[PDB]
Ligand binder design. Structure first.
Ligand SMILES: O=c1cc(O)n([C@@H]2O[C@H](COP(=O)(O)O)[C@@H](O)[C@H]2O)c(=O)[nH]1
Ligand SMILES: O=c1cc(O)n([C@@H]2O[C@H](COP(=O)(O)O)[C@@H](O)[C@H]2O)c(=O)[nH]1
Lengths: 219, 218
């Protein structure tokens, strides 16, 4: 599994190049793994992934939440990996063929899929939550090794960890701004995803350092 | 929304030259183009402005928006800034995520299309069982535009029943995936067509053929 520095992944959702690069540069001593999603990619182009690799030599997880038919999923993954992403995040709710399409591209291109099971926001309770255990089980059956689950629901995160096993890799967003606790989340997740509580801070480096200090005994 | 010939081109070619050429070849037949991530992630969001400059077509951005409310807001803002007239949003992630997109759309004078049931076989696993409720959710939220599957006309018909005849319904899965243009237009206002046109030996003849086959419905 990827070796995430300090068990902390930056969710870089700032939407202009200059700010995104500044903030990522400021926290680079603490974090070697950056999640780049559509807020930044749609604002600045897929070439932003190349710029981050060039400037920081950080791993990049492309947060695409791939959620299309298999044929379109294949195209999305191919374009994303071509750009230099180490891994891509894929929704499980559109079903097994859609996931398998992404896995097939990732295998061909020598990259990784992360399967998003249950989401962290309140709306996730309407439809996703009731499907999530089965989505995880589907991931296990398809041979998925990397997963995403919600910090905001420790009981659900615990269950997802059970389903996927200790050997699978699990990352968890919802820490900080959405109310999840770093240490508690790391009881089950290999790494925590943190966006706003770092990138909106007066001093992002201090904010990251503070989160790390708070989980020091878990590193 | 007034879609020419009830036909929306899904332009999923992944290089600028081919995408522009093929769209140009069928431009006389359409005034609405769906542009998605295969093209946008390969060529940049600036491609949307280029389509508007070249073709003066309506643009539906196929983002399958499926994030938390805060991120959904950002995705919609970026997408509408690029000149999209409308955006496709998943209903599965729940009401707050949809409302986030509705808020931005209202602010920028654009439209949200709510994707209810999808057209591929995998949709049967989780989406299909939620789809009626997702549609009702759309109605509750005041959503006027919907997307449902050409590949399952009985499910498409049910979706039409739920949203009413006043709502606008577009439908992919026509051609390559097995859906029939005419049958689909019994229930949808417009059909979405990608490969059957853009992979055809002659895209223009392909579009012309499709339109001929639904001539009585226009
Ligand atoms: O269930 C999920 C899955 C996500 O990818 N995310 C993503 O993780 C990040 C959370 O950022 P923040 O720490 O600012 O709440 C955002 O990029 C969001 O899109 C999430 O919040 N919940
Ligand atoms: O349920 C759905 C929803 C979609 O947006 N789509 C999209 O509609 C288009 C279908 O293209 P095609 O005619 O080549 O099958 C693709 O862009 C696909 O991503 C779909 O096929 N099924």
């Amino acid at each position: 599994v990827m070796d995430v520095m300090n068990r902390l992944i930056l969710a870089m959702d700032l939407m202009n190049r200059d700010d995104a690069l500044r903030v990522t540069g400021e926290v680079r001593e603490y974090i070697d793994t950056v999640k780049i999603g559509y807020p930044l990619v749609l604002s600045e182009g897929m070439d932003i992934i190349a710029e981050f690799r060039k400037r920081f030599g950080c791993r990049i997880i492309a947060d695409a939440k791939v959620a299309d038919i298999p044929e379109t999923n294949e195209k999305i993954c191919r374009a994303t990996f071509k750009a230099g992403a180490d891994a891509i995040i894929v929704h499980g709710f559109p079903g097994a063929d859609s996931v398998r399409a992404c896995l097939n591209v990732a295998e061909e291109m020598g990259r990784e899929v992360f399967l998003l099971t249950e989401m962290s926001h309140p709306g996730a309770e309407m439809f996703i939550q009731g499907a999530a255990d089965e989505i995880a089980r589907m991931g296990v059956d398809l041979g998925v090794k990397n997963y995403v689950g919600p910090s905001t629901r420790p009981e659900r995160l615990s269950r997802l960890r059970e389903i996927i096993g200790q050997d699978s890799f699990l990352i968890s967003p919802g820490v900080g701004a959405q109310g999840g606790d770093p240490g508690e989340t790391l009881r089950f997740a290999d790494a925590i995803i943190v966006g706003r509580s770092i990138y909106l801070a007066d001093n992002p480096a201090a904010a990251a350092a503070g989160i790390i200090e708070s989980i020091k005994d878990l590193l």
